[PDB]
RNA sequence: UUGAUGUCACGGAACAGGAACUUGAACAACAUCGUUAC
RNA sequence: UAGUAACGAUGUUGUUCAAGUUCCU
């Protein structure tokens, strides 16, 4: 007897839904049920485990229906159809039941009876309210009825927040899920009415279904009728094979910023070969098993799998990899929500019959990158995230337009309300418009990866970063525009007048939407706006209204669209919104840096720092911008800001602002109020191409780079010809410009960033920012007065520079050595704290020097950008792969001769450490040394005893003695009758060993005049001699020795004086004879046939090295001469080589074996014989500490990386040819012991000894780097206040140098009337310096000399001649060395040179350091072995800074500060000046008439032209060993 | 998968504070191999 | 019985980032 409506909701926009519970927190006295009752909810079957599906209830639409239709008669004066409405009835006497009452004022209409209920004919609208029943409205769900795993399936929990209006910062917040509307868009169910109800209550019931708009928080429409993972492990798993486990971090922060394309892995960076062996893209792979994988390959790879070609997919796996892989590398409260308050009657009001309905289309764009945040979990890579659309599509959520709505309402009045969330609805003036406007959502269809950033937290105490402050942050892109539509319906006609004044304001640009603002974040601008009003107060137009539902939907939308006339309705009171711009223009004169590693690492130039730059979108790409970060700017200035004022007595960057109203907390605010600024960012005006600089870090002991510390750097090039400008804005209060103390701190702090303090950007430390005019505009001159510079111009000229006194004794006739280290004082002092860099210091100084940088020798500075820059063109460029002659340019920026600032900084850096006896800033404190030891059997190699490591890596068992076997040879056969598992060294042998051979002579006591003179026939005793056969060279014999004991036979050689009593042979004479004893150790296997004597047999283990101790040459050498033609070739395996020539001719001694290659080489092979150690010692093992291992090791890795060793791998000794890495259980070993301890262990009898502590611990403890602990603490060199360290600021910066008139090269061009180019020289080899001829020995007896000072002298011409420093040759081009174009002398530089903070004396040790006295001269440039670079600088206006107002120039106060400084140099030392002296020895300059010649010696005297005795004979004499640390301190002393 | 005579949740901005920065001359001379003789 | 004496040849490149903080109020 009843009938069924089915209906159907389609949503909008993305709804909301509460969260499931158990079924007894279900009362009206939860507090989280409740708040919770207009949402969906979510229903899980099988309770106790999150499996369900959503549903929206009945009794929500039943009062939404309710509520829509009280709206709809009032607008009527409640004539339904015909017959009028009963007022209704909402009053119920209980309230036990009923846990939300209702808190509305119903409205009214023809006030009458409330109709009773013990009636019969009800009135439509009791009809509707249900007074078995007249209307059941039944559940809602989907329409297939599935079922998913959980609501995070289709949800994401986000958090909303209530922010405050005063302290813009926030209060209590609470957190509800919300789901999207593109994947479930559609719900259904059914009314079952009754039959007995009526004929218009139908009506009512539809017209009402079709002018409700909103359900559950969101607008409706309702309507009737398996890679990643594993790929992760694999490249964990070559990350620890090797031991690059460090390496983590920095690749996964890598490859997650792949995920912008898939284009990008194929770009990946290379070596400086062009080769493909990056330090992080090619770990794992190695020499051997080159089935071994790199990340590259498995990046390549994984490119290209037709399932991550899809754009969504390779994001995804990007992202998931890269999380992964950090989540490996890491491991290595307050939500007030409801308050309801129950009240028993509600007050009835009425409101009126006249309403109008205001739709404004149109869209807002983005100016500036925005920032919604919505950090989530399960992923913890970023932690400041925002907030996207389950596609990624960039979504503005409409509860911020709806806060950012309220706070301009209440920001165009001046009252903040205060509602309390419970009670009666508020009435103040911003609510009741706040409770007709109706927003949307956008989606923006972007759909592009955003950026990320890095920041951080600098202290004002030392300078840098401070321990814990290092984070992320993503932006939404720049220029993305969303739609908009807003919707207000009420009683005036049209919008209210705040309505029209605030859409003004966002139509003029001010729409501050959301985001860190403080920074400049988003600031949309309204663009393209509508309006049309229509009319829902009668009735030809209401029922259109109702016919289509509104124009809600799509095509109701754009049906709409076209009948909208343009411009909005400008209001009546204007009230000029509350934020003034202010425009910003820099101008720069140096380069300029602002770091990005990640982007470095990633890219293409293959470079370690590369500036940063962001993007744009333009409706689906980005294109790229260099700028520079707004972050960093409001840093710079909030600095200069904070270090000026005082505020009683501590300066502003010493307070913690706890609740103090500082200068600052009301400017820039705190983390308790919001700040009264915000900045954006600067873009260029320009596109600079990039350059890169290379780096270095030249070790002070043994001038010449450090190991791992080279590098380089991309900044922007800017010089005084392209000053590379900036532009920018800021926006600032309106009711801050209006103040006087403000504006002043303001134009204060500009005043002193103008004058070139605070240089914006990265390494300001050598010259990058230098900030050069800073000039705003836009503020009336409110601001832009305190910013004028005045200065004064009390003329003096500098004091000269003092006279020499120190002087040498040069002459002719004598050869002298460029190194000449300097010794150092015992004491340096570390007692001082340092200053710190917060307000400037009272008693201490702050200004500028300019100098002037003078040459006087030839000066080479290349530019290593580009090799062969002297290439004779119209001829092939080069082959991929080849070893030129590399060629170098000089040093240009912009097609400007320059020198750069690191350079001037390190030089004088060097000089002024020496000078006050500092700390070694850098100094490389391993690499053990090792030195080849000699042969001689009473010094090194009686100690070396034969021994054996035993099967357990612990202990050595000695031998007794050895003698030795030979191979090689021709007379015998070694290589054939043993098996392959005795000559490795691991299975006993016998062996027949002799000690002594024995020799015969006819008459001893008549050879006096002849022999008889050896004193070694002083054993002989007596011998029988008999006959048996006659040979071709010799005659055999058979003696006895005293009685007849022992007989031995032999072949005897007689000579001239023998001869005579050989004559008569008749086989069986007695003659007399005379025996002698000599010295034979040797081992055959088993006998020869020409020694049948008294052998004996032993026992014992036998090893062979191979073929080693070549003479190898390049020249047909002596002993490959004389000899008889066809050379054989290199054998191609060893066991197989045998002797051809003899060394010796006239006698069979000592074999060699000459052979050739293909090549020039000449091969020369001693060494016929091996060693067999016998007689193994039981009962006697020593065990081996880790020393030993430790020395071992070392040895292996000398041995096994040799540039000058043999180039044929069969001559090579075992160690090297097999790439041995530690002792095994058995092997060859001479150890040498010490009372149960081994000391150290030599694969064969000569090899070279390593000595065990590290070079670091040769020194004085007190000269190491003056680093560590040991605000920040007073224990620093006094060489690491002045310049920095790390940890702790410097306080000197250098600039670029730059040359003004012609430029004066040292030989001519190829091409004249072009007078900016230089024709190029060619040098000597260069080499790399040893370390091991300062330290000879290893003992204790040598300690660490000084920092090695090159020597001034006129060895140039030589080379510009085109010969040999030492020798007087030509000198020919090959693969390792260069050809530069160079200067000449007589060329001015001038730079500058900033400070701040220093002392007075200080100061005056710096000035003297940068001009020395009359005659010395500083030394800088590459090549100064030779004579090459030695400048000498004068210091021009010295002006200081007394206060931002005025500078004070005081040239006329240096000659105070030198004495000072001189001063305070007596005060450390009283009378030990000595390494003053000897360094003002080392920088004096030959003036006139003063050739002194040096060079470095050759290697032996047969090999110059004038034969100077070279290092060979050095050895001993005069620099023998123990007079190389005296003869190398000492200032000047000839080489002779 | 609710309950009926009473739901302003379009009734609540995830907001407020933070310098990818500190230190570092693109440079440079003597080593590398083991045994042979008595 | 039971280890002593020290000679011969002249050729050749290397490092290409390291040490720090990596999130809190």
């Given at each position: 007897?009843?009938?069924?409506?089915?209906?159907?909701?389609?949503?909008?926009?993305?709804?909301?839904?509460?969260?499931?519970?158990?079924?007894?927190?279900?009362?009206?006295?939860?507090?989280?049920?409740?708040?919770?009752?207009?949402?969906?909810?979510?229903?899980?079957?099988?309770?106790?485990?999150?499996?369900?599906?959503?549903?929206?209830?009945?009794?929500?639409?039943?009062?939404?229906?309710?509520?829509?239709?009280?709206?709809?008669?009032?607008?009527?004066?409640?004539?339904?159809?015909?017959?009028?409405?009963?007022?209704?009835?909402?009053?119920?006497?209980?309230?036990?039941?009923?846990?939300?009452?209702?808190?509305?004022?119903?409205?009214?209409?023809?006030?009458?009876?409330?109709?009773?209920?013990?009636?019969?004919?009800?009135?439509?609208?009791?009809?509707?309210?249900?007074?078995?029943?007249?209307?059941?409205?039944?559940?809602?769900?989907?329409?297939?009825?599935?079922?998913?795993?959980?609501?995070?399936?289709?949800?994401?929990?986000?958090?909303?927040?209530?922010?405050?209006?005063?302290?813009?910062?926030?209060?209590?917040?609470?957190?509800?899920?919300?789901?999207?509307?593109?994947?479930?868009?559609?719900?259904?169910?059914?009314?079952?009415?009754?039959?007995?109800?009526?004929?218009?209550?139908?009506?009512?019931?539809?017209?009402?279904?079709?002018?409700?708009?909103?359900?559950?928080?969101?607008?409706?429409?309702?309507?009737?009728?398996?890679?990643?993972?594993?790929?992760?492990?694999?490249?964990?798993?070559?990350?620890?094979?090797?031991?690059?486990?460090?390496?983590?971090?920095?690749?996964?922060?890598?490859?997650?910023?792949?995920?912008?394309?898939?284009?990008?892995?194929?770009?990946?960076?290379?070596?400086?070969?062009?080769?493909?062996?990056?330090?992080?893209?090619?770990?794992?792979?190695?020499?051997?098993?080159?089935?071994?994988?790199?990340?590259?390959?498995?990046?390549?790879?994984?490119?290209?799998?037709?399932?991550?070609?899809?754009?969504?997919?390779?994001?995804?796996?990007?992202?998931?990899?890269?999380?992964?892989?950090?989540?490996?590398?890491?491991?290595?409260?307050?939500?007030?929500?409801?308050?309801?308050?129950?009240?028993?009657?509600?007050?009835?009001?009425?409101?009126?019959?006249?309403?109008?309905?205001?739709?404004?289309?149109?869209?807002?764009?983005?100016?500036?990158?925005?920032?919604?945040?919505?950090?989530?979990?399960?992923?913890?890579?970023?932690?400041?995230?925002?907030?996207?659309?389950?596609?990624?599509?960039?979504?503005?959520?409409?509860?911020?337009?709806?806060?950012?709505?309220?706070?301009?309402?209440?920001?165009?009045?001046?009252?903040?309300?205060?509602?309390?969330?419970?009670?009666?609805?508020?009435?103040?003036?911003?609510?009741?418009?706040?409770?007709?406007?109706?927003?949307?959502?956008?989606?923006?269809?972007?759909?592009?990866?955003?950026?990320?950033?890095?920041?951080?937290?600098?202290?004002?105490?030392?300078?840098?970063?401070?321990?814990?402050?290092?984070?992320?942050?993503?932006?939404?892109?720049?220029?993305?525009?969303?739609?908009?539509?807003?919707?207000?319906?009420?009683?005036?006609?049209?919008?209210?007048?705040?309505?029209?004044?605030?859409?003004?304001?966002?139509?003029?640009?001010?729409?501050?939407?959301?985001?860190?603002?403080?920074?400049?974040?988003?600031?949309?601008?309204?663009?393209?706006?509508?309006?049309?009003?229509?009319?829902?107060?009668?009735?030809?137009?209401?029922?259109?209204?109702?016919?289509?539902?509104?124009?809600?939907?799509?095509?109701?939308?754009?049906?709409?669209?076209?009948?909208?006339?343009?411009?909005?309705?400008?209001?009546?009171?204007?009230?000029?919104?509350?934020?003034?711009?202010?425009?910003?223009?820099?101008?720069?004169?140096?380069?300029?840096?602002?770091?990005?590693?990640?982007?470095?690492?990633?890219?293409?130039?293959?470079?370690?720092?590369?500036?940063?730059?962001?993007?744009?979108?333009?409706?689906?790409?980005?294109?790229?911008?260099?700028?520079?970060?707004?972050?960093?700017?409001?840093?710079?200035?909030?600095?200069?800001?904070?270090?000026?004022?005082?505020?009683?007595?501590?300066?502003?960057?010493?307070?913690?602002?706890?609740?103090?109203?500082?200068?600052?907390?009301?400017?820039?605010?705190?983390?308790?109020?919001?700040?009264?600024?915000?900045?954006?960012?600067?873009?260029?005006?320009?596109?600079?191409?990039?350059?890169?600089?290379?780096?270095?870090?030249?070790?002070?002991?043994?001038?010449?780079?450090?190991?791992?510390?080279?590098?380089?750097?991309?900044?922007?090039?800017?010089?005084?010809?392209?000053?590379?400008?900036?532009?920018?804005?800021?926006?600032?209060?309106?009711?801050?410009?209006?103040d006087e103390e403000y504006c002043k701190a303001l134009g204060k702090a500009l005043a002193d960033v103008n004058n070139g303090l605070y240089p914006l950007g990265g390494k300001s430390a050598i010259g990058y920012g230098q900030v050069k005019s800073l000039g705003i505009k836009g503020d009336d001159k409110r601001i832009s007065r305190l910013m004028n510079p005045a200065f004064d111009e009390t003329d003096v000229a500098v004091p000269?520079?003092?006279?020499?006194?120190?002087?040498?004794?040069?002459?002719?006739?004598?050869?002298?050595?460029?190194?000449?280290?300097?010794?150092?004082?015992?004491?340096?002092?570390?007692?001082?704290?340092?200053?710190?860099?917060?307000?400037?210091?009272?008693?201490?100084?702050?200004?500028?020097?300019?100098?002037?940088?003078?040459?006087?020798?030839?000066?080479?500075?290349?530019?290593?950008?580009?090799?062969?820059?002297?290439?004779?063109?119209?001829?092939?460029?080069?082959?991929?792969?080849?070893?030129?002659?590399?060629?170098?340019?000089?040093?240009?920026?912009?097609?400007?001769?320059?020198?750069?600032?690191?350079?001037?900084?390190?030089?004088?850096?060097?000089?002024?450490?020496?000078?006050?006896?500092?700390?070694?800033?850098?100094?490389?404190?391993?690499?053990?040394?090792?030195?080849?030891?000699?042969?001689?059997?009473?010094?090194?190699?009686?100690?070396?005893?034969?021994?054996?490591?035993?099967?357990?890596?612990?202990?050595?068992?000695?031998?007794?003695?050895?003698?030795?076997?030979?191979?090689?040879?021709?007379?015998?056969?070694?290589?054939?009758?043993?098996?392959?598992?005795?000559?490795?060294?691991?299975?006993?042998?016998?062996?027949?060993?002799?000690?002594?051979?024995?020799?015969?002579?006819?008459?001893?006591?008549?050879?006096?005049?002849?022999?008889?003179?050896?004193?070694?026939?002083?054993?002989?005793?007596?011998?029988?001699?008999?006959?048996?056969?006659?040979?071709?060279?010799?005659?055999?014999?058979?003696?006895?020795?005293?009685?007849?004991?022992?007989?031995?036979?032999?072949?005897?050689?007689?000579?001239?004086?023998?001869?005579?009593?050989?004559?008569?042979?008749?086989?069986?004479?007695?003659?007399?004879?005379?025996?002698?004893?000599?010295?034979?150790?040797?081992?055959?296997?088993?006998?020869?046939?020409?020694?049948?004597?008294?052998?004996?047999?032993?026992?014992?283990?036998?090893?062979?090295?191979?073929?080693?101790?070549?003479?190898?040459?390049?020249?047909?050498?002596?002993?490959?001469?004389?000899?008889?033609?066809?050379?054989?070739?290199?054998?191609?395996?060893?066991?197989?080589?045998?002797?051809?020539?003899?060394?010796?001719?006239?006698?069979?001694?000592?074999?060699?074996?000459?052979?050739?290659?293909?090549?020039?080489?000449?091969?020369?092979?001693?060494?016929?014989?091996?060693?067999?150690?016998?007689?193994?010692?039981?009962?006697?093992?020593?065990?081996?500490?880790?020393?030993?291992?430790?020395?071992?090791?070392?040895?292996?890795?000398?041995?096994?990386?040799?540039?000058?060793?043999?180039?044929?791998?069969?001559?090579?000794?075992?160690?090297?040819?097999?790439?041995?890495?530690?002792?095994?259980?058995?092997?060859?070993?001479?150890?040498?012991?010490?009372?149960?301890?081994?000391?150290?262990?030599?694969?064969?009898?000569?090899?070279?000894?390593?000595?065990?502590?590290?070079?670091?611990?040769?020194?004085?403890?007190?000269?190491?780097?003056?680093?560590?602990?040991?605000?920040?603490?007073?224990?620093?060199?006094?060489?690491?206040?002045?310049?920095?360290?790390?940890?702790?600021?410097?306080?000197?910066?250098?600039?670029?140098?730059?040359?003004?008139?012609?430029?004066?090269?040292?030989?001519?061009?190829?091409?004249?009337?072009?007078?900016?180019?230089?024709?190029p020289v060619m040098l000597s080899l260069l080499e790399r310096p040893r370390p091991t001829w300062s330290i000879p020995g290893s003992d204790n007896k040598f300690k660490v000399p000084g920092r090695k000072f090159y020597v001034h002298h006129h060895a140039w011409k030589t080379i510009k001649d085109g010969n040999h420093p030492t020798t007087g040759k030509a000198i020919e081009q090959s693969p390792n060395n260069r050809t530069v174009?160079?200067?000449?002398?007589?060329?001015?530089?001038?730079?500058?040179?900033?400070?701040?903070?220093?002392?007075?004396?200080?100061?005056?040790?710096?000035?003297?350091?940068?001009?020395?006295?009359?005659?010395?001269?500083?030394?800088?440039?590459?090549?100064?072995?030779?004579?090459?670079?030695?400048?000498?600088?004068?210091?021009?206006?010295?002006?200081?800074?007394?206060?931002?107002?005025?500078?004070?120039?005081?040239?006329?106060?240096?000659?105070?500060?030198?004495?000072?400084?001189?001063?305070?140099?007596?005060?450390?030392?009283?009378?030990?000046?000595?390494?003053?002296?000897?360094?003002?020895?080392?920088?004096?300059?030959?003036?006139?008439?003063?050739?002194?010649?040096?060079?470095?010696?050759?290697?032996?005297?047969?090999?110059?032209?004038?034969?100077?005795?070279?290092?060979?004979?050095?050895?001993?004499?005069?620099?023998?060993?123990?007079?190389?640390?005296?003869?190398?301190?000492?200032?000047?002393?000839?080489?002779?």
């Amino acid at each position: 007897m009843t009938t069924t409506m089915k209906i159907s909701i389609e949503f909008l926009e993305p709804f909301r839904m509460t969260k499931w519970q158990e079924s007894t927190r279900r009362n009206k006295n939860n507090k989280e049920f409740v708040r919770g009752q207009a949402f969906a909810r979510w229903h899980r079957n099988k309770k106790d485990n999150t499996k369900g599906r959503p549903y929206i209830t009945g009794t929500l639409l039943r009062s939404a229906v309710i509520r829509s239709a009280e709206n709809l008669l009032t607008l009527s004066d409640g004539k339904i159809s015909e017959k009028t409405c009963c007022p209704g009835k909402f009053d119920t006497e209980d309230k036990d039941r009923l846990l939300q009452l209702r808190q509305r004022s119903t409205l009214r209409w023809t006030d009458k009876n409330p109709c009773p209920d013990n009636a019969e004919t009800y009135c439509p609208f009791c009809e509707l309210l249900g007074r078995r029943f007249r209307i059941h409205f039944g559940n809602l769900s989907l329409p297939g009825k599935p079922d998913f795993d959980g609501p995070k399936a289709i949800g994401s929990q986000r958090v909303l927040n209530r922010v405050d209006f005063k302290s813009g910062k926030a209060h209590d917040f609470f957190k509800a899920y919300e789901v999207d509307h593109t994947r479930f868009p559609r719900f259904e169910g059914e009314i079952t009415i009754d039959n007995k109800v009526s004929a218009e209550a139908r009506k009512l019931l539809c017209d009402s279904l079709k002018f409700t708009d909103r359900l559950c928080g969101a607008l409706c429409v309702i309507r009737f009728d398996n890679l990643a993972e594993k790929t992760a492990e694999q490249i964990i798993s070559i990350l620890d094979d090797n031991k690059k486990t460090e390496y983590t971090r920095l690749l996964a922060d890598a490859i997650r910023s792949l995920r912008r394309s898939s284009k990008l892995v194929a770009g990946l960076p290379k070596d400086h070969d062009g080769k493909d062996d990056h330090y992080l893209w090619d770990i794992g792979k190695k020499k051997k098993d080159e089935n071994s994988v790199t990340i590259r390959q498995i990046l390549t790879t994984s490119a290209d799998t037709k399932e991550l070609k899809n754009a969504g997919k390779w994001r995804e796996f990007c992202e998931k990899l890269g999380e992964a892989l950090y989540l490996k590398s890491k491991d290595m409260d307050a939500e007030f929500h409801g308050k309801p308050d129950r009240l028993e009657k509600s007050r009835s009001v009425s409101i009126g019959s006249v309403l109008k309905e205001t739709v404004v289309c149109g869209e807002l764009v983005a100016k500036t990158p925005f920032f919604f945040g919505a950090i989530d979990e399960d992923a913890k890579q970023t932690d400041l995230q925002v907030l996207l659309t389950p596609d990624n599509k960039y979504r503005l959520p409409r509860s911020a337009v709806r806060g950012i709505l309220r706070r301009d309402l209440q920001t165009y009045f001046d009252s903040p309300c205060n509602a309390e969330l419970g009670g009666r609805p508020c009435m103040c003036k911003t609510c009741r418009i706040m409770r007709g406007i109706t927003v949307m959502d956008a989606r923006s269809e972007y759909n592009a990866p955003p950026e990320i950033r890095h920041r951080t937290r600098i202290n004002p105490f030392t300078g840098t970063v401070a321990e814990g402050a290092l984070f992320n942050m993503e932006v939404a892109p720049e220029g993305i525009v969303f739609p908009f539509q807003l919707r207000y319906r009420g009683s005036e006609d049209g919008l209210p007048d705040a309505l029209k004044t605030v859409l003004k304001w966002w139509a003029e640009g001010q729409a501050f939407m959301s985001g860190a603002a403080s920074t400049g974040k988003g600031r949309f601008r309204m663009e393209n706006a509508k309006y049309e009003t229509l009319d829902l107060s009668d009735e030809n137009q209401r029922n259109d209204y109702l016919k289509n539902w509104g124009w809600r939907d799509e095509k109701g939308l754009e049906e709409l669209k076209k009948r909208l006339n343009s411009g909005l309705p400008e209001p009546g009171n204007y009230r000029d919104p509350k934020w003034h711009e202010i425009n910003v223009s820099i101008e720069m004169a140096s380069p300029f840096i602002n770091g990005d590693p990640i982007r470095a690492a990633v890219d293409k130039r293959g470079t370690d720092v590369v500036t940063f730059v962001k993007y744009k979108a333009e409706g689906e790409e980005a294109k790229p911008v260099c700028a520079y970060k707004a972050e960093s700017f409001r840093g710079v200035i909030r600095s200069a800001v904070a270090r000026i004022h005082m505020e009683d007595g501590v300066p502003l960057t010493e307070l913690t602002h706890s609740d103090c109203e500082c200068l600052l907390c009301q400017i820039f605010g705190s983390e308790y109020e919001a700040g009264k600024i915000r900045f954006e960012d600067l873009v260029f005006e320009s596109d600079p191409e990039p350059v890169t600089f290379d780096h270095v870090a030249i070790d002070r002991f043994t001038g010449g780079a450090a190991d791992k510390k080279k590098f380089d750097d991309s900044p922007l090039p800017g010089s005084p010809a392209r000053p590379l400008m900036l532009k920018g804005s800021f926006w600032i209060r309106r009711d801050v410009l209006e103040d006087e103390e403000y504006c002043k701190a303001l134009g204060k702090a500009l005043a002193d960033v103008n004058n070139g303090l605070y240089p914006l950007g990265g390494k300001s430390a050598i010259g990058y920012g230098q900030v050069k005019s800073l000039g705003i505009k836009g503020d009336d001159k409110r601001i832009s007065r305190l910013m004028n510079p005045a200065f004064d111009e009390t003329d003096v000229a500098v004091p000269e520079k003092p006279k020499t006194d120190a002087e040498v004794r040069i002459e002719a006739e004598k050869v002298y050595y460029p190194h000449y280290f300097v010794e150092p004082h015992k004491k340096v002092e570390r007692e001082e704290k340092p200053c710190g860099h917060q307000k400037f210091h009272e008693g201490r100084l702050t200004g500028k020097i300019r100098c002037k940088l003078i040459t006087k020798t030839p000066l080479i500075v290349p530019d290593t950008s580009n090799d062969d820059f002297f290439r004779p063109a119209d001829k092939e460029a080069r082959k991929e792969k080849d070893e030129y002659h590399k060629s170098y340019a000089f040093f240009r920026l912009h097609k400007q001769i320059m020198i750069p600032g690191s350079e001037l900084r390190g030089m004088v850096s060097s000089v002024y450490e020496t000078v006050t006896n500092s700390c070694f800033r850098i100094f490389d404190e391993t690499k053990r040394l090792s030195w080849r030891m000699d042969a001689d059997h009473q010094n090194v190699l009686q100690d070396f005893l034969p021994g054996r490591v035993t099967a357990d890596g612990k202990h050595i068992q000695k031998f007794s003695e050895t003698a030795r076997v030979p191979f090689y040879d021709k007379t015998q056969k070694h290589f054939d009758i043993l098996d392959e598992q005795e000559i490795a060294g691991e299975k006993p042998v016998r062996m027949w060993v002799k000690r002594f051979i024995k020799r015969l002579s006819l008459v001893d006591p008549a050879k006096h005049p002849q022999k008889k003179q050896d004193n070694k026939w002083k054993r002989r005793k007596e011998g029988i001699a008999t006959f048996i056969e006659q040979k071709n060279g010799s005659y055999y014999f058979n003696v006895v020795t005293n009685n007849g004991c022992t007989s031995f036979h032999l072949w005897h050689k007689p000579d001239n004086f023998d001869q005579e009593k050989l004559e008569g042979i008749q086989n069986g004479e007695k003659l007399d004879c005379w025996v002698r004893d000599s010295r034979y150790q040797k081992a055959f296997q088993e006998i020869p046939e020409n020694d049948p004597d008294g052998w004996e047999c032993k026992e014992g283990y036998l090893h062979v090295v191979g073929p080693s101790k070549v003479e190898f040459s390049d020249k047909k050498g002596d002993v490959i001469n004389n000899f008889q033609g066809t050379l054989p070739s290199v054998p191609n395996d060893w066991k197989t080589i045998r002797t051809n020539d003899f060394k010796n001719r006239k006698r069979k001694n000592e074999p060699v074996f000459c052979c050739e290659d293909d090549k020039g080489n000449y091969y020369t092979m001693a060494k016929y014989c091996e060693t067999f150690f016998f007689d193994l010692k039981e009962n006697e093992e020593y065990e081996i500490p880790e020393k030993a291992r430790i020395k071992y090791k070392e040895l292996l890795r000398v041995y096994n990386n040799n540039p000058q060793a043999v180039p044929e791998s069969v001559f090579q000794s075992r160690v090297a040819r097999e790439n041995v890495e530690k002792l095994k259980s058995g092997d060859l070993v001479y150890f040498k012991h010490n009372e149960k301890y081994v000391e150290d262990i030599v694969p064969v009898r000569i090899s070279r000894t390593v000595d065990d502590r590290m070079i670091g611990k040769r020194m004085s403890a007190d000269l190491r780097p003056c680093h560590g602990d040991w605000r920040h603490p007073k224990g620093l060199c006094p060489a690491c206040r002045l310049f920095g360290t790390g940890s702790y600021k410097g306080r000197v910066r250098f600039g670029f140098a730059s040359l003004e008139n012609d430029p004066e090269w040292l030989i001519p061009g190829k091409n004249p009337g072009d007078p900016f180019h230089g024709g190029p020289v060619m040098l000597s080899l260069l080499e790399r310096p040893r370390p091991t001829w300062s330290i000879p020995g290893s003992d204790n007896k040598f300690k660490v000399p000084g920092r090695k000072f090159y020597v001034h002298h006129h060895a140039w011409k030589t080379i510009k001649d085109g010969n040999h420093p030492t020798t007087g040759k030509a000198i020919e081009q090959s693969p390792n060395n260069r050809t530069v174009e160079a200067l000449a002398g007589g060329n001015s530089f001038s730079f500058e040179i900033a400070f701040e903070n220093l002392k007075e004396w200080e100061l005056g040790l710096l000035i003297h350091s940068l001009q020395l006295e009359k005659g010395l001269a500083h030394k800088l440039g590459m090549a100064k072995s030779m004579g090459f670079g030695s400048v000498e600088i004068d210091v021009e206006s010295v002006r200081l800074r007394k206060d931002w107002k005025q500078w004070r120039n005081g040239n006329s106060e240096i000659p105070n500060w030198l004495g000072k400084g001189f001063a305070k140099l007596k005060e450390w030392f009283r009378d030990e000046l000595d390494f003053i002296e000897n360094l003002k020895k080392l920088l004096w300059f030959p003036e006139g008439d003063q050739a002194p010649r040096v060079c470095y010696p050759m290697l032996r005297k047969k090999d110059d032209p004038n034969g100077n005795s070279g290092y060979e004979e050095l050895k001993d004499g005069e620099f023998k060993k123990e007079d190389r640390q005296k003869k190398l301190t000492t200032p000047w002393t000839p080489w002779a």
